[PDB]
Design a protein around this nucleic acid. Structure first.
Ligand SMILES: [Zn+2]
Length: 832
DNA sequence: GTCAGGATACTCCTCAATCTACCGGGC
DNA sequence: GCCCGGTAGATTGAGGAGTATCCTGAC
């Protein structure tokens, strides 16, 4: 009962056709639930007939208590290992298990289910005690090394020359194991031994980079290509050696390097691609194929499909970009027209690993998922726009009804669970452990959903199931604390780190368990905890930082980086930049604090000296979340850009007084000089007579010039900006205090007086005008603001309250403005 | 019958930036 | 009781390893 396609596929081995038909009923009885695909996969190998006959003969005894091999495991071994591996396993059933080797059946299957399984199994059985005792190697490492094609040679090479690489090259056994855990490990190890001094001395390459390069499939060829092409790539093409080793640290890096060398000028001249884009595209598996596909299909996708080159690069910037590009070219118009999905969604689906599988699954499953199960196409694209989208989508298709009618979960919860990397694992773990968690430990379904909705939720859920009782009982933590700890990316590592490190971090450095939970409740909390352990005494005795400050610095996503950056940059910022350590702690106690600290170090002198900004303003700007982009944007706008943009950016920092007095009329020149003097004195800075003469010359020589008095003391001068209020952007309100004499004093909403913080109008322009009149004894003046909502309903009373006795004020809202509510007023009103 | 190399596909772990919904004192 | 600000979460994107499976050439 085989189809034509199955017979054609199995006809690769001519002798397998006869044996399968004669005894077709025989394997079914011996191998229950054996699907035709498994049979055709087993029988299509070099010894399909022999392997099938051996399985049929031996499966009666291969299911014994010493092995207890499942049917799927037997089929996999027959397909991969062959007749030799099956015979070796059967002949040594009692040798592998129940022996000083101490090998589980899963490890035995993994070693056997590989090319040359018999030789690898014999080598393991002969050399496991030797490598365990003489070299002190973990049996897991030996199994991992031997679980590869030609693993016997790699194991023998490791046993032969582990001490040589350990001593004469200073390489840890872990690096050797990682290098030898790939195909052709013996050749890679020999190449490393013969080449490490040459690549480390003449080429000046870090041994870690060489180890990383050699820790891939075919590392010997990659190392040889690197040695042969490093000077050429560094000189002719101007490629950084770090970039070269990053490109060559993938599977088949030799082909990628050759393609890059052969096609860099072509893509950089006849295609417009930058070297960085080509490097990024080539920094993935199958780089040669991706580069060739990009070069061949760039005009086709750019013109016929209307795709920007950046989108093509991003699609090809992943593993297997050739298949994704071909699938996009084949399936863009038919899927877009017949389903109406935006091309951005199609790009987002294929912008990950295995995008072709996700795209095909979406094309197949959109109608049925949207019809029977009721998912929105946006939800489907959200689930498919992740690593392994095919697995998550097929799992949703298979599993949604039983999850939504038996376990009492909503479809949106399932959509959230399945919309993460490895969503199939999370879905299956939920289906397997939801009753257990909701019964044995009392966790609510919402907590389980929250735990399972991160990258690697299966490991987090299993870790919770294993470690929740012991953490909750021995360590005295409420289950809510463990749920909070585990509900993060890579939460298994954080949970194991907490279980390991709670007693020492409590009884050694005197940290409250709540502090440990706060440190560990963020992504990458294991690194934060280890860094706190290693650094806390250093920050205590060597710099006088309290443990509370260390915990506050570490209680963020980038806690390790922030702590290391604080340790490295505390003396320089505290001595050569004039920053108090408290300001450093405040800057670092934010998400991405390492970048903020480095940006402060880099841009403090240029901002403080060239543009005349106080260090306090820089610290305040950098003390907010995401302060690095804010500082970079401020530097960009201050160094170049529009005059009005620079003026607004400078005034928005606060403490800056601008003036647009006009004409000569020496009297108001004197008054303006007096006002500048008063502001400088209020800032504690003496402006001296030379700057008085300078500003007087500027005022007398530039008609209609607007000044700016920063808190530092520098007087920025702008030639011309505008004589009218700017457009209202919805959050920033601008005002000008026009006196009777003629002086115009600019104002901007926000950054109000801290003294009246409890007052709700703190920051409005009318309040700033009132305080300015009160301080400088201004009798009468008017205001003009460009708020389109009119004056606020609080200001009409509060600003009149702040006015001095006997003082007058006027505010004029714009004519085009309309009041938004009864509180607001959209007409001229005189206050007193 | 093995050994070495290349190509996809998938999972998990750490980081940095931005968005928003709950709380809270004043009206 | 009803806000609008503050801010502590809560997405959202990104990169970097680590893991697993399959196909091909050469003896
Ligand atoms: Zn106001």
């Amino acid at each position: 009962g085989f189809t034509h396609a199955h017979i054609v596929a199995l006809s690769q081995h001519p002798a397998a056709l006869g044996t399968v038909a004669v005894k077709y009923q025989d394997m079914i009885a011996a191998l229950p639930e054996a699907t035709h695909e498994a049979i055709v996969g087993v029988g299509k190998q070099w010894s399909g007939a022999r392997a099938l006959e051996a399985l049929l003969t031996v499966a009666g005894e291969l299911r014994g208590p010493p092995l207890q091999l499942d049917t799927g495991q037997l089929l996999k071994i027959a397909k991969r290992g062959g007749v030799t591996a099956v015979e070796a396993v059967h002949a040594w059933r009692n040798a592998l298990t129940g022996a000083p080797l101490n090998l589980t059946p899963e490890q035995v299957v993994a070693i056997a289910s590989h090319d040359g399984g018999k030789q690898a199994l014999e080598t393991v059985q002969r050399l496991l005690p030797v490598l365990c005792q003489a070299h002190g190697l973990t049996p897991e490492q030996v199994v991992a090394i031997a679980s590869n094609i030609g693993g016997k040679q790699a194991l023998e090479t490791v046993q032969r020359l582990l001490p040589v690489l350990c001593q004469a090259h200073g390489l840890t056994p872990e690096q050797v194991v990682a290098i030898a855990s790939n195909n052709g490990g013996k050749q890679a190890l020999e190449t490393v031994q013969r080449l490490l001094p040459v690549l480390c001395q003449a080429h000046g390459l870090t041994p870690e980079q060489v180890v990383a390069i050699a820790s891939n499939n075919g590392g010997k060829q990659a190392l040889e290509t690197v040695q042969r092409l490093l000077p050429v790539l560094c000189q002719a093409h101007g490629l950084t050696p770090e970039q070269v080793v990053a490109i060559a640290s993938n599977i088949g890096g030799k082909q990628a390097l050759e393609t890059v060398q052969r096609l860099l000028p072509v893509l950089c001249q006849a295609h417009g691609l930058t070297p960085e884009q080509v490097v990024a595209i080539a920094s993935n598996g199958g780089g040669k194929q991706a580069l060739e596909t990009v070069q061949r299909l760039l005009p086709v996708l750019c013109q016929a499909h209307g795709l920007t080159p950046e989108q093509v690069v991003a699609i090809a910037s992943n593993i297997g970009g050739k298949q994704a590009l071909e699938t996009v070219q084949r399936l863009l118009p038919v899927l877009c027209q017949a389903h109406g999905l935006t091309p951005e969604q199609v790009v987002a689906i294929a912008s990950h690993d295995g995008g072709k599988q996700a795209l095909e699954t979406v094309q197949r499953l959109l109608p049925v998922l949207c019809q029977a199960h009721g998912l929105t196409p946006e939800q489907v694209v959200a689930i498919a726009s992740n690593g392994g989208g095919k697995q998550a989508l097929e799992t949703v298709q298979r599993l949604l009804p039983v999850l939504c009618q038996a376990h009492g979960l909503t479809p949106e919860q399932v959509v959230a669970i399945a919309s993460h990397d490895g969503g199939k694992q999370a879905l299956e773990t939920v289906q397997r452990l939801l009753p257990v968690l909701c019964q044995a430990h009392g966790l609510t379904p919402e907590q389980v959903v929250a735990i399972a909705s991160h990258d690697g939720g299966k490991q987090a859920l299993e870790t919770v199931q294993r470690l929740l009782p012991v953490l909750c009982q021995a360590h005295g933590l409420t289950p809510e604390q463990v749920v909070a700890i585990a509900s993060n990316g890579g939460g298994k590592q954080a949970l194991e780190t907490v279980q390991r490190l709670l007693p020492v971090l409590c009884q050694a450095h005197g940290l409250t368990p709540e502090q440990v939970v706060a440190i560990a409740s963020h992504d990458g909390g294991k690194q934060a905890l280890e860094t706190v352990q290693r650094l806390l005494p250093v920050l205590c005795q060597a710099h006088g930082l309290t443990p509370e400050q260390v915990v506050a610095i570490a209680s963020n996503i980038g806690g390790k980086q922030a702590l290391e950056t604080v340790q490295r940059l505390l003396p320089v910022l505290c001595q050569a930049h004039g920053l108090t350590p408290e300001q450093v702690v405040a800057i670092a106690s934010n998400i991405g604090g390492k970048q903020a600290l480095e940006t402060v170090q880099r841009l403090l002198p240029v901002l403080c000296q060239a543009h005349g900004l106080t260090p306090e303003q820089v610290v305040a700007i950098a003390s907010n979340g995401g302060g690095r982009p804010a500082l970079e944007a401020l530097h960009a706008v201050l160094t170049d850009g529009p005059e009005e943009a620079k003026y607004e950016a400078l005034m928005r920092l606060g403490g800056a007084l601008a003036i647009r007095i006009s004409d000569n009329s020496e009297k108001q020149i004197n008054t303006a000089i007096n006002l500048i003097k008063n502001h400088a004195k209020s800032k504690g800075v003496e402006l001296s007579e030379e700057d008085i003469k300078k500003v007087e010359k500027i005022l007398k020589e530039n008609p209609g010039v607007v000044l700016l008095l920063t808190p530092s003391g520098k007087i920025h001068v702008f030639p011309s900006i505008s004589w009218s209020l700017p457009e209202y952007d919805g959050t920033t309100t601008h005002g000008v205090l026009v006196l009777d004499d003629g002086t115009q004093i600019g104002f901007t909403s926000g950054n109000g007086d801290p003294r009246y913080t409890n007052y709700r109008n703190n920051g409005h322009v009318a309040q700033k005008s009132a305080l300015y009149m009160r301080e400088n004894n201004i009798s009468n003046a008017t205001v003009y603001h460009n708020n389109t909502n009119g004056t606020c309903g609080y200001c009409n009373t509060m600003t009149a309250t702040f006015l001095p006795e006997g003082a007058t004020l006027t505010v004029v809202p714009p004519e085009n403005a309309v009041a938004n509510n009864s509180r607001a007023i959209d007409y001229v009103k005189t206050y007193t």
